[PDB]
């Protein structure tokens, strides 16, 4: 039958000194299976369920590398949004991202997700057609404009269409 995989990433800037608080959590069907936390004693990806401990050590290392990579991405783009919305340098803000795939019974992609939110408001999201973007406001249109010119929709669609579906298949087997 149908299956799904979702990843939720959130970065929250803090007043005062200190980098943003970043968190990443993944879900299979609707069960948390992986999690990363920047404010952890040992920041790294870790299994949340027994059937995830069967992944090689190198699996969790390179995947934790993506975390650090994603974390820096959220750091740089939190600053970009402060300028787009002309916000005071003194405040807390949260940039969020959700991405994933739903797979039908035939094993093929049923629906793909790639959407971002800023301070609890939708910013930009990949439409179900996986070809166009919905830009909530004028600031989002700056991003959408540059993403249409760079063919970002196809880029993300490639992942959702292949890797997302393939890894969901693997996880379900284990």
């Amino acid at each position: 039958g149908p299956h799904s995989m979702r990843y939720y990433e959130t970065a929250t800037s803090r007043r005062g000194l200190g980098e943003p608080r970043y968190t990443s959590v993944g879900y299979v069907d609707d069960k948390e299976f992986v999690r990363f936390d920047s404010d952890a004693e040992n920041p790294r990806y870790e299994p949340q369920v027994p059937w995830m401990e069967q992944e090689g050590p190198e699996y969790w290392e390179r995947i934790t590398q993506v975390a650090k990579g994603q974390e820096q991405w959220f750091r740089v783009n939190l600053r970009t949004l402060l300028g787009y919305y002309n916000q005071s340098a003194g405040g807390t803000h949260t940039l969020q991202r959700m991405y994933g795939c739903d797979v039908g019974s035939d094993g093929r992609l049923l629906r793909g997700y790639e959407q971002f939110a800023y301070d609890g408001c939708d910013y930009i999201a990949l439409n179900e057609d996986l070809r166009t973007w919905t830009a909530a406001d004028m600031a989002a249109q700056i991003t959408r404009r540059k993403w249409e010119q760079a063919g970002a929709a196809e880029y993300y669609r490639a992942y959702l269409e292949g890797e997302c579906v393939e890894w969901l298949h693997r996880y379900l087997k284990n």
Partner: peptide, 9 residues
């Protein structure tokens, strides 16, 4: 596996 790094906003 995780998706590739997204383009910049």
């Amino acid at each position: 596996q995780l998706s590739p790094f997204p383009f910049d906003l």
